[PDB]
Amino acid sequence: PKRPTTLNLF
Amino acid sequence: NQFYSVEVGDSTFTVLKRYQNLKPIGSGAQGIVCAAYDAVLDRNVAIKKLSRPFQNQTHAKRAYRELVLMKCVNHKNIISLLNVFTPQKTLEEFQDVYLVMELMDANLCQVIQMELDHERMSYLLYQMLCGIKHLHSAGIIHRDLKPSNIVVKSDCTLKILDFGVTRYYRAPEVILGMGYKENVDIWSVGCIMGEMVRHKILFPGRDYIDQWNKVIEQLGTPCPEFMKKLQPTVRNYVENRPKYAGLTFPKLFPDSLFPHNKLKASQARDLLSKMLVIDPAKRISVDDALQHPYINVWYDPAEVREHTIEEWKELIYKEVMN
Numbered sequence: 001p002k003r004p005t006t007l008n009l010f
Numbered sequence: 011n012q013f014y015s016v017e018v019g020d021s022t023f024t025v026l027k028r029y030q031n032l033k034p035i036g037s038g039a040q041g042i043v044c045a046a047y048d049a050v051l052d053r054n055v056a057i058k059k060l061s062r063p064f065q066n067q068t069h070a071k072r073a074y075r076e077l078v079l080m081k082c083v084n085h086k087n088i089i090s091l092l093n094v095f096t097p098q099k100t101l102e103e104f105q106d107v108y109l110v111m112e113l114m115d116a117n118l119c120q121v122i123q124m125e126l127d128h129e130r131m132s133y134l135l136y137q138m139l140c141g142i143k144h145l146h147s148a149g150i151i152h153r154d155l156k157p158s159n160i161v162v163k164s165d166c167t168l169k170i171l172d173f174g175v176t177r178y179y180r181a182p183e184v185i186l187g188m189g190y191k192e193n194v195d196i197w198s199v200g201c202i203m204g205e206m207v208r209h210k211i212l213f214p215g216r217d218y219i220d221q222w223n224k225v226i227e228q229l230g231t232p233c234p235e236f237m238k239k240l241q242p243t244v245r246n247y248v249e250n251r252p253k254y255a256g257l258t259f260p261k262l263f264p265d266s267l268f269p270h271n272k273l274k275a276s277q278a279r280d281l282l283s284k285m286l287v288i289d290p291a292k293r294i295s296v297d298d299a300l301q302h303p304y305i306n307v308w309y310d311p312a313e314v315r316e317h318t319i320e321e322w323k324e325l326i327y328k329e330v331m332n
């Protein structure tokens with residue numbers, strides 16, 4: 001399964 | 011001279027010259043944590059000056075214990091120690107120990123308040139659980155997990171800071187002083203997940219009395235088999251409270267609050283109903299939480315004594331050079 005690679009901390 | 015000094019608050023950090031542009035990012039018991047640039051790694055790091063490690067046996071044995079565990083409990087979801095050093099060059103002199111760790115981008119405080127898909131929600135929770143599992147494997151029960159203790163990166167990686175104010179994430183058996191086990195930390199995970207979904211601290215309040223009320227108000231009174239298990243004094247307060255049934259999980263966490271989506275919603279809620287359990291004997295374990303359908307999608311096996319002060323300085327110094 002493809003895990004997320006982005007998280008908008010900005 | 012390999013070292014230089016930088017004044018940070020009422021503290022001086024005397025650091026290797028490779029660590030540059032020190033700036034404070036943390037202030038809490040243990041002390042000031044500074045962010046810094048590491049010129050040798052071409053990377054940002056966090057530098058923590060242990061607090062008064064040779065003030066007494068108690069401080070010394072805890073410093074030594076902190077060092078050994080950080081140096082050998084490594085994992086992708088626990089903040090890694092990159093270096094440790096002292097500016098003093100003899101035992102006579104030896105006073106300060108500096109820990110250099112990874113620096114990530116932020117706390118969970120930020121992320122909790124933003125609305126996240128189930129993929130991110132559950133991938134974060136998966137990493138949390140994995141990091142907690144490795145801690146426990148190493149014999150470390152945290153007891154004070156919370157959003158400010160858990161740090162994240164821009165690619166959705168997550169690490170746990172260390173191992174023991176906001177008391178809102180502490181488990182009822184601590185609150186009540188009944189002794190505790192590994193799944194003490196599952197409650198905290200429940201609180202953080204609940205707050206991720208609701209965007210509000212689940213159990214606020216001034217103090218532990220207020221705390222308990224919010225817990226029973228929402229979750230309902232625990233049963234007598236929980237109360238019997240209480241020390242008589244705490245058992246007499248806790249049995250005089252209103253006998254609440256609880257608001258129930260479908261209403262504490264309705265579909266509305268979530269973003270398959272109904273049976274991802276209901277999986278999240280089922281996981282929450284198994285972690286947000288007052289009685290530790292009836293509360294889910296880390297292994298079981300990792301095995302839950304909501305979390306299990308990411309599953310990857312690859313991831314899941316008396317001494318003088320002097321004598322303690324010898325032992326710690328050995329560790330600094332390691």
Ligand SMILES: COC(=O)c1sccc1NC(=O)Cc1cccs1
Pocket residue numbers: 035036037043056089111112113114115116117161162171
């Ligand atoms: C105060 O001490 C720390 O916040 C530490 S100690 C090792 C990492 C971090 N913080 C981070 O990685 C990311 C951050 C959290 C808060 C500010 S930046």
